[PDB]
Design a binder for this molecule. Structure first.
Ligand code: MG
Ligand code: MG
Lengths: 130, 320, 71
RNA sequence: UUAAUUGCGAUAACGAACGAGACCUUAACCUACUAAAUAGGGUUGCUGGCACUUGCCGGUUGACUCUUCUUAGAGGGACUAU
């Protein structure tokens, strides 16, 4: 019946979010780090805190996880977010500068008074039986 | 050139914790002292007979906590052990009893260094300090200058310095992200080395004593000159390099990455071999990496102490 | 008591043999002794963990109650 | 899911407080430290007996020495560690 209640989980989360570069995979080194970088009153709570910190560190090493965040992970997320493809995914870069439509939006383009090279195709108004 | 292959020849089972450090004496080639997380040292006698490369000789109990760094004496009859109980222990390699109990570090000791001669003991501890002791047990010097933990201190061997100087030069590094040089007789500072993005995990002067190799969390291995006080080269390991070691015969750097053991050929600035033993029943994400590396006196065998409580020896077997 | 003393001598003799072999004889000898011992009645080298439970009020036993009446 | 309104979470709910947990006493483990004629041990004295080989079981508040057990302080240890 070990569930590691609020205090240890929150303290370990803050420990990771403020000290990820210094934390390691090993329990004993992280125990010493918990001793020096944080003032845990007792020592059983210190051991529980270090153990959950090691568990969360192992989970992070396996991959990215919900809830906790740190400088390196958010920087990586931002760098991945800033990805913009050099090649155009619009303006008819594919299908040899031709995009397929039906009659209705073709008349939409016509009534808009714009040239807009198109390609008509009936949509076979019979609907799938699903 | 130098088509040199190294093959695992034996496994030295018997420890019960991660084999944190290894040491070997030049005078005595068949003895190997290894300290582990089981708070004990083990002396191994090497047998060139069949599968097992060595034979444990004596277990050195007397340490309350993790044994981090182990150093044997120059003669090969004494061994100094640094442990996580803030104390150092001097052991007779034959009697098995402890001679001296060095006390005074307020933080658990992470590394210890032997003098080139049998005069001074250099110890690095978590209390951000370095301590210089006599062989009796008292502390002679308390060297400061590091604002954080000092993880590794191993002495630069005097090769041909002028004739003779009677000056003891070594290096120190840790979580201060710096590498410092120290000179002893007196017993004061020397030049600095600042290259590491993350903090330094381990440093090691070359066997001659003119190249210093440092490593850290980011796997950025740096090679510097001490007698010239300049950088020599820089590589990236791209994993967690736990420990590293020069080689006596070849111009090589073994590096204990979190994935395996790389060897870097220094003259060609290119890695040549990778060492990854074959385990069973794992998930490929927690394979036992290396924490201790030690070459033989000649440079023919390599001892690697892993996290699975095992020493594995790779013997150099040049398959043409 | 008697049998507790006997088990104490058992463990003392075994541990003395093992410690002496470690201290002055050899490693393999001590390891072989430990293999012969621990493969048989682990208590031979490891002290027993069980110790008596303190008694509590409301019952004549360490973890027993007295009786109920209900009427 | 937990022994737990213990957590993972989903969410017109957000942040919190008491309880639980944490915390103290006690029981373990400490051939690691400090030590001890108000606790023990070794060597050696001075003796008793049996053996006769230098050894066995004893006695002495005679000396030197040690802390493994007995103590009690600072600490270590387990955090479900791998
Ligand atoms: Mg009863
Ligand atoms: Mg004691």
């Amino acid at each position: 019946g070990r569930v590691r209640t609020k205090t240890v989980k929150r303290a370990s989360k803050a420990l990771i979010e403020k000290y990820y570069p210094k934390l390691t995979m090993d329990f004993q080194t992280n125990k010493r780090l918990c001793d020096e970088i944080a003032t845990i009153q007792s020592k059983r709570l210190r051991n529980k805190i270090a153990g959950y910190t090691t568990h969360l560190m192992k989970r992070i090493q396996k991959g990215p996880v919900r809830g906790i965040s740190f400088k390196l992970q958010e920087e990586e997320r931002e760098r991945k977010d800033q990805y913009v493809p050099d090649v155009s995914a619009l303006d008819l870069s594919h299908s040899n500068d031709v995009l397929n439509v039906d009659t209705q939006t073709a008349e939409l383009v016509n009534s808009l008074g714009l040239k807009l090279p198109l390609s008509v195709s009936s949509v076979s108004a019979v609907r799938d039986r699903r | 050139s130098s088509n040199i292959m190294l093959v695992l020849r034996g496994t030295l089972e018997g420890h019960n914790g991660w084999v944190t450090s290894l040491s070997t004496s030049a005078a005595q080639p068949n003895l190997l002292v290894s300290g582990s997380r089981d708070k004990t040292l083990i002396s191994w006698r090497l047998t060139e007979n069949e599968q097992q490369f060595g034979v444990p000789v004596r277990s050195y109990k007397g340490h309350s906590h993790i044994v981090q760094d182990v150093v044997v004496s120059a003669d090969g009859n004494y061994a100094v052990s640094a442990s996580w109980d803030k104390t150092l222990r001097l052991w007779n390699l034959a009697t098995g009893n402890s001679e001296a109990r060095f006390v005074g570090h307020t933080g658990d000791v992470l590394s210890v260094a032997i003098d080139a001669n049998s005069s001074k003991i250099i110890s690095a501890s978590r209390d951000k300090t370095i301590r210089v002791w006599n062989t009796v047990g008292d502390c002679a010097y308390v060297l400061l200058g590091h604002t954080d933990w000092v993880t590794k201190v191993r002495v630069a061997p005097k090769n041909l310095e002028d004739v003779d100087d009677g000056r003891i030069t070594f290096v120190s590094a840790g979580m201060d992200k710096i590498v410092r040089s120290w000179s002893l007789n007196s017993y004061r500072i020397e030049a600095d080395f600042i290259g590491h993005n993350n903090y330094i995990n381990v440093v090691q002067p070359s066997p001659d004593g003119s190249l210093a190799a440092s490593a850290g969390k980011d796997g950025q291995i740096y090679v510097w000159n001490l007698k010239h006080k300049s950088a020599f080269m820089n590589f990236d390991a791209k994993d967690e390099v736990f420990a590293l070691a020069f080689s006596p015969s070849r111009f090589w750097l073994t590096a204990a990455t979190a994935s395996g053991i790389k060897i870097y050929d220094l003259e060609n600035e290119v890695l040549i071999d990778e060492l990854k033993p074959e385990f069973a029943g794992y998930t490929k994400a927690q394979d036992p990496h290396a924490v201790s590396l030690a070459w033989s006196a000649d440079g023919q065998t390599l001892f690697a102490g892993y996290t699975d409580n095992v020493i594995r020896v790779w013997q150099v077997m040049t398959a043409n | 008591g008697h049998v507790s003393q006997v088990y104490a001598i058992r463990q003392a003799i075994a541990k003395g043999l093992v410690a002496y072999h470690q201290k002055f004889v050899d490693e393999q000898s001590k390891n072989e002794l430990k293999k012969a011992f621990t493969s048989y009645d682990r208590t031979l080298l490891i002290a027993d963990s069980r110790r008596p439970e303190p008694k509590k009020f409301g019952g004549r036993g360490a973890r027993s109650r007295f009786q109920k009446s209900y009427r």
